Write a protein that binds this ligand. Sequence first.
Ligand SMILES: [Ca+2]
Ligand SMILES: [Cl-]
Ligand SMILES: [Zn+2]
Lengths: 76, 251
Amino acid sequence: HINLKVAGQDGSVVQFKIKRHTPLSKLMKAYCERQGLSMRQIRFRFDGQPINETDTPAQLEMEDEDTIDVFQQQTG
Amino acid sequence: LCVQWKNAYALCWLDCILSALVHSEELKNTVTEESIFWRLLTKYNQANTLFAEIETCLNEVRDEIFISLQPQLRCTLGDMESPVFAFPLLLKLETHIEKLFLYSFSWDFECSQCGHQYQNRHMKSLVTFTNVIPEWHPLNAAHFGPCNNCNSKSQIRKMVLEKVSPIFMLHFVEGLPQNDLQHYAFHFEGCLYQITSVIQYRANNHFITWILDADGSWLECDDLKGPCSERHKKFEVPASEIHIVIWERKI
Ligand SMILES: [Ca+2]
Ligand SMILES: [Cl-]
Ligand SMILES: [Zn+2]
């Protein structure tokens, strides 16, 4: 049950408690619901790599108090 | 007139980085040795000294770079992507090159609604700015943001530079307030920093690199425009399309 911080580029930080083996989709969707953002309009990043909704903290070797970077989706 | 990559497999998010790297004086000085950056600049110069032969030499090193990024970036050839994600992953492949870009700063925040304040030191190669103040300047690098304690909006968070690397890059979600790049030059602890290149975000789906040449003119490296580049008398991208800005220390 690790604690994760989801940090947006505006300086916002949202704390989340999550189990190591549950997929991050529930975290992502809840962050979008809290901030009023669209899943299609933002990207999540951990340790420089984009993270999918199927990813789990254990698969990405996340530790307690680690940080996920949220970006407005700007691809091309 | 310099050479550039041609568009293919939606690799504009990578071509724009490659053009910026090969025209960096500090990078060229450091690389000049089985480095991927040495291979990049050697193949580019080998191509720049000379149309299909040029494309093959440029495509080989681009492919090698893409394959190096693939595990970290988790993309498939032909996927769209962002240089904001790709640029630092490329730099982290070699610590001796990444050191040229790693600057130290601190995020300074102070809410006016409640008392919440913090000052957190970080070390990054590419920081993102959104909703910058109209007076935004590298020496006054502030933007509007919410407060995590009371949810008040339009508070200000400020980047306080502490140690600037020879190359200094920033990403702007909505661009810069204006596009006269001379006003964003700055000294920091005795060293001059000038904008030498800019990555433009066009139509929210395409990246193009602009290079400052010695005579003060500019070079547009739009990979759609074939192997050659285009010379412009002065800078031209709309301010809201200024995506990544590259400062380089002047020697
Ligand atoms: Ca240059
Ligand atoms: Cl130059
Ligand atoms: Zn507050």
